[PDB]
Design an enzyme around this catalytic site. Structure first.
Site, PDB file in Angstrom:
ATOM      1  N   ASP A   1      93.272   0.629  10.992  1.00  0.00           N
ATOM      2  CA  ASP A   1      92.695   2.102  10.405  1.00  0.00           C
ATOM      3  C   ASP A   1      92.784   3.311  11.542  1.00  0.00           C
ATOM      4  OD1 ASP A   1      92.502   1.591   7.979  1.00  0.00           O
ATOM      5  OD2 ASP A   1      90.535   2.160   7.740  1.00  0.00           O
TER       6      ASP A   1
ATOM      7  N   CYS B   1     106.268   2.568   6.706  1.00  0.00           N
ATOM      8  CA  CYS B   1     104.835   3.570   6.911  1.00  0.00           C
ATOM      9  C   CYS B   1     104.130   4.213   6.074  1.00  0.00           C
ATOM     10  CB  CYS B   1     104.334   3.446   8.321  1.00  0.00           C
ATOM     11  SG  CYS B   1     105.029   4.469   9.280  1.00  0.00           S
ATOM     12  N   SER B   2     103.678   5.253   6.531  1.00  0.00           N
ATOM     13  CA  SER B   2     103.024   6.298   5.743  1.00  0.00           C
ATOM     14  C   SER B   2     104.116   7.158   5.253  1.00  0.00           C
ATOM     15  CB  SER B   2     101.491   6.344   5.747  1.00  0.00           C
ATOM     16  OG  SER B   2     101.585   7.940   4.583  1.00  0.00           O
ATOM     17  N   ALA B   3     103.919   7.804   6.733  1.00  0.00           N
ATOM     18  CA  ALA B   3     105.131   9.221   7.066  1.00  0.00           C
ATOM     19  C   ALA B   3     106.097   8.294   7.758  1.00  0.00           C
ATOM     20  CB  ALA B   3     104.597   9.960   8.038  1.00  0.00           C
ATOM     21  N   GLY B   4     106.569   7.162   7.851  1.00  0.00           N
ATOM     22  CA  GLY B   4     107.776   6.320   8.324  1.00  0.00           C
ATOM     23  C   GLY B   4     108.514   7.399   9.944  1.00  0.00           C
ATOM     24  N   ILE B   5     107.434   7.136  10.601  1.00  0.00           N
ATOM     25  CA  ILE B   5     107.692   8.168  11.967  1.00  0.00           C
ATOM     26  C   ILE B   5     106.933   7.311  13.033  1.00  0.00           C
ATOM     27  CG2 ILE B   5     108.316  10.085  11.601  1.00  0.00           C
ATOM     28  CD1 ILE B   5     106.242  11.545  11.963  1.00  0.00           C
ATOM     29  N   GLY B   6     105.420   6.545  13.214  1.00  0.00           N
ATOM     30  CA  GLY B   6     104.675   6.163  13.760  1.00  0.00           C
ATOM     31  C   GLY B   6     104.701   4.900  13.635  1.00  0.00           C
ATOM     32  N   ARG B   7     103.755   4.247  13.561  1.00  0.00           N
ATOM     33  CA  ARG B   7     103.963   2.440  13.066  1.00  0.00           C
ATOM     34  C   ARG B   7     105.600   2.329  13.084  1.00  0.00           C
ATOM     35  NH1 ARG B   7      99.310   1.272   9.498  1.00  0.00           N
ATOM     36  NH2 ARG B   7      98.140   2.645  10.145  1.00  0.00           N
ATOM     37  N   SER B   8     105.924   2.975  11.989  1.00  0.00           N
ATOM     38  CA  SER B   8     108.232   2.319  11.454  1.00  0.00           C
ATOM     39  C   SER B   8     109.145   2.612  12.956  1.00  0.00           C
ATOM     40  CB  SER B   8     108.746   3.339  10.758  1.00  0.00           C
ATOM     41  OG  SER B   8     107.505   2.726   9.728  1.00  0.00           O
TER      42      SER B   8
ATOM     43  N   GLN C   1     103.939   8.724  17.395  1.00  0.00           N
ATOM     44  CA  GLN C   1     103.360   9.886  16.615  1.00  0.00           C
ATOM     45  C   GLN C   1     101.908  10.016  18.142  1.00  0.00           C
ATOM     46  OE1 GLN C   1     102.626   8.150  13.073  1.00  0.00           O
ATOM     47  NE2 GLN C   1     102.477  10.573  12.315  1.00  0.00           N
TER      48      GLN C   1
END
Ligand SMILES: CO[C@H]1CN(S(C)(=O)=O)[C@@H]2CC[C@@H](OC)[C@H]1C2
Length: 284
Positions: free
Chosen positions: A181, A215-222, A262
């Site tokens: 998390d 992912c949630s925003a599509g920029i960090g983990r993605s 991010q």
């Protein structure tokens, strides 16, 4: 500089935040006018994360062709990816329309539906074989065929049917279920094992449309997923693998979607993943 020793030099000097801020300063800025039209407000999860106009995916619809999704096309590596936000209650039908129209084989999900006690994306696939989903706005039917639950990730086989033509296709859902998390994983080993499972399925290969990653925003983990994959492929293709510059690859990818990676911790984790992954590829 090489990667592994540039890495130790940033750790010893504690300068990850400065390196990451340099990337943010040099990153491309292109217009995202379609994303900001008033009619699209409920199609965006976050007001500060939008696809650029020049690289956005268009839905094949004359009313409203907008989805928060970007085509990342890596020319030297010969790989393409679609990066998108986690679907919203009013965009789950658009999401599967895109998968269909772009001829994707695989979907890569890097978040849980609930994290930190809040919803991070809609429940957009069926959880039981006998309870299929129908998306009436885009005329698609989606059925769970099988599910394989492992310790760090789950793989699902799904059937997507275009109800207009009665054509069907098999889609693979690769769900990484153990990203913490807060922060990043301590070791990249399970993330790399997951990447290799996606590769082994054919979902990243040129005989299919681009993989859809979110992912949630599509920029960090993605961003971490596609950056690690492309860097490892370049190390295999080139005569001199130590010439692969992860910061330069990241800036190239940021020409196609804003904000990839991010935090400075995500940047350090990406270095770690590429470094460890390059040892397993070989030759050993
Ligand atoms: C914000 O803290 C960051 C800064 N850096 S740093 C001191 O510049 O190396 C480190 C990288 C990992 C990160 O973890 C969040 C910490 C430690």
């Amino acid at each position: 500089m090489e990667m592994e020793k540039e890495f130790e030099q940033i750790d010893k000097s504690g300068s990850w935040a400065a390196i990451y801020q340099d990337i943010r300063h040099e990153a491309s800025d292109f217009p995202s006018r379609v994303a900001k039209l008033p009619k699209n407000k409920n199609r965006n999860r976050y007001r500060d994360v939008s696809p650029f106009d020049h690289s956005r995916i268009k839905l094949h619809q004359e009313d409203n062709d907008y989805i928060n999704a970007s085509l990342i096309k890596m020319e030297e590596a010969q790989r393409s990816y679609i990066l998108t936000q986690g679907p919203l209650p009013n965009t789950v039908g658009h999401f599967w329309e895109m998968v269909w129209e772009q001829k994707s084989r695989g979907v890569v999900m890097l978040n849980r539906v609930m994290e930190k006690g809040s919803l991070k994306c809609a429940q957009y696939w069926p959880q039981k074989e006998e309870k299929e989903m129908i998306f009436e706005d885009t005329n698609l039917k989606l059925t769970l065929i099988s599910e394989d639950i492992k310790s760090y990730y789950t793989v699902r086989q799904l059937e997507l049917e275009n109800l207009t033509t009665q054509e069907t296709r098999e889609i693979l859902h690769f769900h990484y279920t153990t990203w913490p998390d807060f922060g990043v994983p301590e070791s990249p080993a399970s993330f790399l094992n997951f990447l290799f499972k996606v590769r082994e399925s054919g979902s990243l290969s040129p005989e299919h449309g681009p993989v859809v990653v979110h992912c949630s925003a599509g920029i960090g983990r993605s961003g971490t997923f596609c950056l690690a994959d492309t860097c490892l492929l370049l190390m295999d293709k080139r005569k001199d693998p130590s010439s692969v510059d992860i910061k330069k690859v990241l800036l190239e990818m940021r020409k196609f979607r804003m904000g990839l990676i991010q935090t400075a911790d995500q940047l350090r984790f990406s270095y770690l993943a590429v470094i460890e992954g390059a040892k397993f590829i070989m030759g050993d």
